[PDB]
Design an enzyme around this catalytic site. Structure first.
Site, PDB file in Angstrom:
ATOM      1  N   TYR A  65    -123.900 -27.697-123.643  1.00 46.81           N
ATOM      2  CA  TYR A  65    -124.020 -28.615-122.517  1.00 46.81           C
ATOM      3  C   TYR A  65    -125.172 -28.218-121.601  1.00 46.81           C
ATOM      4  O   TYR A  65    -125.955 -29.073-121.169  1.00 46.81           O
ATOM      5  CB  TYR A  65    -122.699 -28.657-121.748  1.00 46.81           C
ATOM      6  CG  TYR A  65    -122.682 -29.600-120.569  1.00 46.81           C
ATOM      7  CD1 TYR A  65    -122.465 -30.959-120.746  1.00 46.81           C
ATOM      8  CD2 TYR A  65    -122.865 -29.128-119.275  1.00 46.81           C
ATOM      9  CE1 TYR A  65    -122.441 -31.826-119.669  1.00 46.81           C
ATOM     10  CE2 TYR A  65    -122.842 -29.986-118.191  1.00 46.81           C
ATOM     11  CZ  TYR A  65    -122.631 -31.334-118.395  1.00 46.81           C
ATOM     12  OH  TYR A  65    -122.607 -32.191-117.319  1.00 46.81           O
TER      13      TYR A  65
HETATM   14  N1  LIG Z   1    -117.907 -35.345-113.567  1.00 50.54           N
HETATM   15  C1  LIG Z   1    -118.520 -34.026-113.477  1.00 50.54           C
HETATM   16  O1  LIG Z   1    -117.853 -33.056-113.099  1.00 50.54           O
HETATM   17  C2  LIG Z   1    -119.975 -33.839-113.844  1.00 50.54           C
HETATM   18  C3  LIG Z   1    -120.669 -32.763-113.341  1.00 50.54           C
HETATM   19  C4  LIG Z   1    -121.982 -32.587-113.665  1.00 50.54           C
HETATM   20  C5  LIG Z   1    -122.620 -33.507-114.511  1.00 50.54           C
HETATM   21  N2  LIG Z   1    -121.927 -34.583-115.015  1.00 50.54           N
HETATM   22  C6  LIG Z   1    -122.623 -35.554-115.918  1.00 50.54           C
HETATM   23  O2  LIG Z   1    -122.469 -37.024-115.371  1.00 50.54           O
HETATM   24  C7  LIG Z   1    -122.281 -37.898-116.648  1.00 50.54           C
HETATM   25  C8  LIG Z   1    -120.850 -38.473-116.701  1.00 50.54           C
HETATM   26  O3  LIG Z   1    -120.159 -38.120-115.543  1.00 50.54           O
HETATM   27  P1  LIG Z   1    -118.636 -38.747-115.334  1.00 50.54           P
HETATM   28  O4  LIG Z   1    -117.893 -37.954-114.242  1.00 50.54           O
HETATM   29  O5  LIG Z   1    -118.747 -40.217-114.905  1.00 50.54           O
HETATM   30  O6  LIG Z   1    -117.793 -38.629-116.805  1.00 50.54           O
HETATM   31  P2  LIG Z   1    -116.732 -39.802-117.374  1.00 50.54           P
HETATM   32  O7  LIG Z   1    -115.936 -39.248-118.543  1.00 50.54           O
HETATM   33  O8  LIG Z   1    -115.769 -40.202-116.241  1.00 50.54           O
HETATM   34  O9  LIG Z   1    -117.580 -41.102-117.856  1.00 50.54           O
HETATM   35  C9  LIG Z   1    -118.585 -40.937-118.841  1.00 50.54           C
HETATM   36  C10 LIG Z   1    -118.933 -42.327-119.470  1.00 50.54           C
HETATM   37  O10 LIG Z   1    -120.065 -42.163-120.524  1.00 50.54           O
HETATM   38  C11 LIG Z   1    -119.502 -42.800-121.825  1.00 50.54           C
HETATM   39  N3  LIG Z   1    -119.960 -42.035-122.999  1.00 50.54           N
HETATM   40  C12 LIG Z   1    -119.819 -40.841-123.554  1.00 50.54           C
HETATM   41  N4  LIG Z   1    -120.569 -40.822-124.691  1.00 50.54           N
HETATM   42  C13 LIG Z   1    -121.166 -42.020-124.815  1.00 50.54           C
HETATM   43  C14 LIG Z   1    -122.013 -42.532-125.758  1.00 50.54           C
HETATM   44  N5  LIG Z   1    -122.636 -42.086-126.978  1.00 50.54           N
HETATM   45  N6  LIG Z   1    -122.468 -43.796-125.636  1.00 50.54           N
HETATM   46  C15 LIG Z   1    -122.103 -44.546-124.596  1.00 50.54           C
HETATM   47  N7  LIG Z   1    -121.254 -44.037-123.654  1.00 50.54           N
HETATM   48  C16 LIG Z   1    -120.795 -42.778-123.774  1.00 50.54           C
HETATM   49  C17 LIG Z   1    -118.231 -42.705-121.709  1.00 50.54           C
HETATM   50  O11 LIG Z   1    -117.577 -43.788-122.435  1.00 50.54           O
HETATM   51  C18 LIG Z   1    -117.918 -42.828-120.088  1.00 50.54           C
HETATM   52  O12 LIG Z   1    -117.755 -44.223-119.728  1.00 50.54           O
HETATM   53  C19 LIG Z   1    -122.470 -37.091-117.662  1.00 50.54           C
HETATM   54  O13 LIG Z   1    -123.835 -37.101-118.055  1.00 50.54           O
HETATM   55  C20 LIG Z   1    -122.055 -35.599-117.080  1.00 50.54           C
HETATM   56  O14 LIG Z   1    -122.578 -34.573-117.959  1.00 50.54           O
HETATM   57  C21 LIG Z   1    -120.615 -34.762-114.690  1.00 50.54           C
END
Ligand SMILES: NC(=O)c1ccc[n+]([C@@H]2O[C@H](COP(=O)([O-])OP(=O)(O)OC[C@H]3O[C@@H](n4cnc5c(N)ncnc54)[C@H](O)[C@@H]3O)[C@@H](O)[C@H]2O)c1
Length: 248
Positions: A157
């Site tokens: 990651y």
């Molecule tokens: N929530 C956290 O703690 C956090 C912290 C740092 C970074 N991030 C990054 O922010 C992004 C998501 O955050 P979040 O809190 O909304 O997570 P989440 O699980 O609530 O939502 C992620 C969304 O991306 C979709 N997804 C995953 N793989 C996919 C793919 N191949 N194609 C299309 N859609 C896909 C999922 O269906 C989902 O709707 C990510 O890039 C994550 O790495 C999150």
């Protein structure tokens, strides 16, 4: 509360069905943008469109952003739904399983890199091509604090998010003589985190001086400014959302 104007602009938000992407879409609709949600889950997309329709005009496209061919089909479908493609918020991605490097699954490593890094390239490529043709574009790639620091037991990651940051720096300087801004955000953990133990939550909070996780409200507010017209100079930069943890 501030107000960010988006009249006449259209936006693509990957992973827009829930979480960060959903919060950004909710704020861009307050700026009266035309919003197209890209996501892999067709069920969650239907619930998002139902909740968000009273806020404005929203479309949905089913797409796996880790499949480049599916991305090519997605960008063409989006072109049939908008007059132009002005804003990209790339929020799709997975967290990946936790394991030290000595025990990490090669299959899980390749899965994380394909979705969180290769997928970001596929989406950024097809969208910036349209932004180049219109000489306007605003891009925010939602990375993570892990891309800056290299979190232990999350090497895949962290490596994928660091590539997204370098991709952002590279693409930004390639389009610097155009009216295009390409930037990234490195948020801390958000309130996904409910599968963790309480002791694990205490450890993550001990590294954040604000002693709390970022709210999706606060991320969406900063994204909204980064994709507005007034962000006309800063490009190829990393904007932090770690609550005082990051040191650069
Ligand atoms: N929530 C956290 O703690 C956090 C912290 C740092 C970074 N991030 C990054 O922010 C992004 C998501 O955050 P979040 O809190 O909304 O997570 P989440 O699980 O609530 O939502 C992620 C969304 O991306 C979709 N997804 C995953 N793989 C996919 C793919 N191949 N194609 C299309 N859609 C896909 C999922 O269906 C989902 O709707 C990510 O890039 C994550 O790495 C999150």
């Amino acid at each position: 509360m501030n107000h960010y104007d988006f009249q006449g602009r259209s936006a693509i938000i990957t992973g827009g069905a829930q979480g960060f992407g959903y919060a950004v879409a909710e704020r861009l609709l307050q700026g009266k943008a035309k919003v197209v949600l890209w996501d892999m889950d067709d069920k969650a997309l239907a619930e998002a469109r139902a909740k968000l329709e009273p806020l404005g005009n929203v479309e949905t496209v089913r797409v796996d952003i880790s499949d480049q061919s599916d991305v090519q089909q997605a960008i063409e479908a989006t072109e049939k739904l908008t007059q132009s493609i002005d804003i990209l918020v790339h929020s799709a991605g997975i967290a990946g399983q936790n394991n030290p490097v000595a025990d990490y699954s090669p299959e899980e490593w390749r899965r994380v890199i394909d979705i969180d890094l290769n997928g970001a390239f596929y989406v950024n490529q097809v969208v910036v091509q349209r932004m180049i043709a219109q000489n306007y574009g605003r891009i925010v790639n939602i990375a993570s604090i892990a891309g800056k620091e290299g979190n232990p037991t999350a090497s895949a990651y962290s490596a994928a998010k660091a590539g997204m940051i370098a991709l952002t720096k590279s693409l930004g300087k390639e389009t610097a003589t155009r009216n295009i801004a390409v930037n990234a955000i490195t948020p801390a953990a958000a309130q996904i985190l409910e599968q963790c133990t309480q002791a694990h939550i205490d450890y993550m909070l001990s590294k954040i001086p604000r002693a709390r996780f970022v709210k999706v409200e606060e991320l969406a507010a900063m994204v909204a400014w980064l994709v507005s017209e007034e962000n006309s100079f800063t490009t190829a930069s990393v904007f932090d959302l770690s609550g005082g943890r990051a040191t650069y």
